[PDB]
Symmetry: D3
Subunit: 108 residues, 6 copies
């Protein structure tokens, strides 16, 4: 459809990248191996990925790790709660720098 | 203090670039010239400048345009409301891309 | 394109989020309430909103608050000058960290 | 340098915000309420919080939720593996947009 | 993006801005003026421009400046290696702030 | 940046490879793929600084500004790289501002 058609195309672009520049795809594979090492469970790692995917505003990253979260057995409330946490942290960053603006106003 | 001393150091740094690379300082001066052309008052522009500064996480921009907003007659309630609006728009972005993840999960 | 149909689609997506997860939509309602608290008129609130939206590069946020600023009485010149102000700040941030890099090129050597 | 002094200072600034502007701190609490709803333990939520905090590069968000992760029982390897997952996704966004640049160069634009 | 049609659409919109608000387009020209001044050739400048465009995630910026890299004589290997360097620095920024998180956890640990 | 800040950053990277070696090996793979090709060390470090300005990473700035110096980068090459990165940073805001004015015209 929209995401069910986008994700295979994104995975294909990564495959064409490895056939042309294998050291670049091997660099990402090294990043995924470092992430996979440790007792974290695949679903929790994918949920961590979705929270970062929506923060970086990467549509290809969203669909890849959302489909991987479902394959890992993540329910709908687990994802919505993960997104709600990422929204709170994205808003928390603006709260911190807004706090710096208020502190500057009182100081001048 | 901090902000009352950090802001002069920032403006002193921008003055240094004008001596070493005047073309780059003039380019910024061209950006503020276009930003000042219109019927929007100084307080309105400086409030907009603060909301973008906390979004860009630019501490120098925060202090420079917070002091400038005070010089334009901005009250503390106006800056806090400006920051509240900027905080809201930063979270709505995480909301928008969170909805994309939910639609992605619903389609797989 | 098609901002006239994109904006109602974004609002509908927010509506389905509330009927499936009400505490997330209520949180955005609490954020929108604190943004309305104050003496800044609706036009200045939406102009500020558009400036953050183009800095964020959120398309749904841009169209929602551009239509709202229009209904609040914002002329095209007020919209353009708001973008010119947001673009200027979207360069001073790079200027500030460029000044750090030029200092970084000093000290060394 | 001193996160044990930075984090309490950030917490004090948030508390002073609610005394001068309560609706702003209330909207923050509403975001925390929706975050703590859905049977995801605090350890998993704080680990997710760190992964987003380093993506936003907010030092206040990092130290606040790193301490909260320790209080929830997060091990050092649990955070390191979380950061390793967050780093992989930060590069993943760069890979996806670099693929757009290569597809652009092929079409000769 | 990638399309040979989207890039002329971006350039046309920039010209429309200069017709309605010339002081805004002139400000961008002032920025491009300072970018063109210097010892770097056009290829290296457009390669640097591509690296920022994928970091700033601006599709039109990836557009305008990847074509200018082609016209400047940049090969596919020069485009790709620039992107591999840009990708490395993007992950590097996450590595740096991840170190702060590991340092903060060590100071709170008991 | 400083002559003492960069050694502290590289010391933390080395320590990370001692407690979590797969994470440091992943960054090395990203550096090996970046070094592979005809682009000289100067252009790569200049590209690295321009990204280290778009991203607001100070450690990346000082590390790669020093590496650019050892690679033989001149002051004119450093400033022009920044002016190029500043132009692109403003260029991104110009594009999404064009969609904002395009949306405003559609709602009338
Ligand atoms: N820091 C300032 C306070 C600004 C309040 C404006 N009414 C002193 O004087
Ligand atoms: N998108 C579906 C998952 C599978 C569809 C039918 N097995 C829900 O959630």
């Amino acid at each position: 459809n929209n995401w069910t058609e986008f994700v295979p195309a994104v995975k294909k672009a990564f495959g064409a990248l490895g056939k042309q520049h294998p050291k670049m795809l091997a660099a990402y594979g090294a990043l995924e191996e470092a992430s996979a090492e440790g007792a974290l469970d695949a679903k929790t790692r994918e949920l961590i990925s979705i929270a970062v995917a929506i923060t970086t505003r990467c549509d290809g990253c969203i669909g890849v790790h959302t489909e991987a979260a479902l394959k890992a057995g993540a329910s709908e409330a687990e994802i919505a709660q993960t997104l709600a946490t990422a929204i709170s942290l994205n808003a928390g960053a603006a709260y911190v720098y807004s706090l710096r603006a208020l502190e500057a106003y009182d100081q001048f």
